Structures are given as C-alpha cells and as structure tokens.
Design a binder for this molecule. Sequence first.
Ligand SMILES: [Ca+2]
Length: 224
Amino acid sequence: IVGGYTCEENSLPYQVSLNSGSHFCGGSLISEQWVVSAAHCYKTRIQVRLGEHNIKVLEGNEQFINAAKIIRHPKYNRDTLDNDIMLIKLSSPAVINARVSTISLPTAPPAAGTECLISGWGNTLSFGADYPDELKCLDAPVLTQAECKASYPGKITNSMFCVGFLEGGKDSCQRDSGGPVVCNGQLQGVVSWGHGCAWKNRPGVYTKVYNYVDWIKDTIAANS
Ligand SMILES: [Ca+2]
C-alpha cells in the first residue's frame, strides 16, 4: 500500500497473509475454513497466516494453517488477468475470535463513489520497492467504469473494477495482491493489478467479488 497508514492492530481480523517462505500475497477469510484471494497468487503450496499485524514478529494472536485445496477460477486468464480469483480451503478450521474472523460476501455491487478500505503488507513505494512489517490500510473510493476503462484502454474485462485516485499518490501495490477491498462491511474486491503503483491515471484494478458469490457457494459445496 502506497500512501496509506498503519492499521490498528488486529482491526481487520479477516486479513490474511499468504506465505511460501516469505509473505507474497494477501487474502480474506470468508468462513472458518475458506479464504478468497487472486488466482495470480497461486502456488502449489501455501501457508495461510491469520491474526497477523507485524509479519516479522510473533505477537501471540497468529494462527498458521496450510492450504489443503487451492482452487483457481477455471476461466482465469493468466495473460489478461480476467477472472483473477481463487479459493483456498484450510487444512483445519481457523479459531474465530476477536482477532481472527470473517468478512461478509457482498449482497450487491458497490456504487461508484463508495469509500472502501484496502489493506495489505505490499510495497509502499511508487518507484522501487520497500515492504513493511506492519499491516497497512488505505481509504479509497470506487471509480466509475469509464474512468477505469480510460485508465487502461482495452484491458478492463467484465470481471474488473477500479478503486483509487486518478491523481495518483495512494494505491495498492505488489504483494497486496489477493487481499481485500471492503466497502460497508462487505468484501467487494480482490487486489489484482495495475501499472506501477500510485501513478496518475493508473488506479488499482480489482476483481469484482460480487460476480463470483454463486461460484464461491457452489465450489465450496462441492469441495466439502
Ligand atoms: Ca506476527
């Protein structure tokens, strides 16, 4: 997250870190045993880290649980990032408590102009890279589809929407990928891509979670 602030500790209890030696992506806990992330974050083995604030120091609220199933959307396109979403089934359920808990799936799409909360342990620089120890947060609005499309002409599919600031300065970034965009208490987006981070006319592009609620339901039911 570029241009954000350090979140209050364990104030986003649905935020997870995907770890494969180091942190590499975010995710969102949607039930005791299931996480939503980006398909481009797939690896064959993933450890999910819940209850984190400082990802470098064991503070006492962490739960580390291996992924048992890692299921990309079957229409994920690895060139265009169309359908950039995946589900992770934990090998055992997380213990739900004040510091680890779920985020609701969305009941409607978010309107343009809605203020959302984006979070993660991704890069904090617009040129180069620096990764933080503590979870970062960003308050940002949903942009119109026309703004999204004008920012990335020919690249915005029907699974994508934009959130951010066309003037630049504040955005998600590398290793925020897979993590949440929450608007009015519902998971509306998955951090997906952009050109650079926090550049003018290059807002973040996010997967439209609302478009996948039925897919999530069905996939979970079939893998239970
Ligand atoms: Ca920690």
